[PDB]
Each structure stands twice: as structure tokens, then as C-alpha cells.
Amino acid sequence: SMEQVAMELRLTELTRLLRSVLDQLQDKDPARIFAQPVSLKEVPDYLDHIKHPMDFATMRKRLEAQGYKNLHEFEEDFDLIIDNCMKYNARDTVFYRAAVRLRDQGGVVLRQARREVDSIG
Numbered sequence: 750s751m752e753q754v755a756m757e758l759r760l761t762e763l764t765r766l767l768r769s770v771l772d773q774l775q776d777k778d779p780a781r782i783f784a785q786p787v788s789l790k791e792v793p794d795y796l797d798h799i800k801h802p803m804d805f806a807t808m809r810k811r812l813e814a815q816g817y818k819n820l821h822e823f824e825e826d827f828d829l830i831i832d833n834c835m836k837y838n839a840r841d842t843v844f845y846r847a848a849v850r851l852r853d854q855g856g857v858v859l860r861q862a863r864r865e866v867d868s869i870g
Contacts, residue, residue: 763866764815767823770862771812774827775805777854782847783830787837798837803829820866824859 778784786804787795795802808826817823834848 759870760815760818762869763817763819764812766862766865766869767812767817767820770823770858771805771808773858774851774855777851777858778805778847780843780847782844783834783851795837799833801829801833803833805830820863827855827859
């Protein structure tokens, strides 16, 4: 149908905007602490602690499959990256501190993204 196509164009444009958001958020992680999944070879107990692991490469795979229907789903995944880290790692670690800084810096990006998504529809 013409409607399904129009819907698919909207999704594609959402995907375009979320790709730009993702790049901006990932720049706020210059140490690449959140770039890849936590290694189950190196942290064999991880899934005993964290039930829904997340990282930027995994979000990128979802994004490129057009797997985010709206900004809320994308933000859920970004919040998992932060929240998982702040549970698994103690306050006095480079990891926890990296997550706090990512959260604080990403807030600004995500604020305008929401306005853009609402604005452009």
C-alpha cells in the first residue's frame, strides 16, 4: 500500500535521526568503555548480575535493522548501558565514573532529540 510505504519512509527517517543521536552519545565515551558487550569469557559471572546486557555495538545492529520504532525504545537501551554499569561496578571505579559522565553528557543530546522527533513527527 501507499500507507505502508509512507510508514516505512518515517521509520527510515527516524533511523537516520537515531543514527546521528547514537554517534553523538558514543562520542561522549572516548575511552570506548561501552563500545562492545561485556566479554563473558573475561567476566564469566556477568549474567548472574546483569539480566539485560547492552552496549553501543548491539544498539547499532538494532538501529541498522530499523529495529527502534520510537525514541523511547532507543533511550531504554541507552539507559541499560548506564544502569548496568552503575550496578556491576563500584562507585570508585573508572567504569562507574565513565557511566555517570555518559549519562550527564548524553542528557543534553537526548533532550534535543525528543524535541526533534516530536517536531518533525
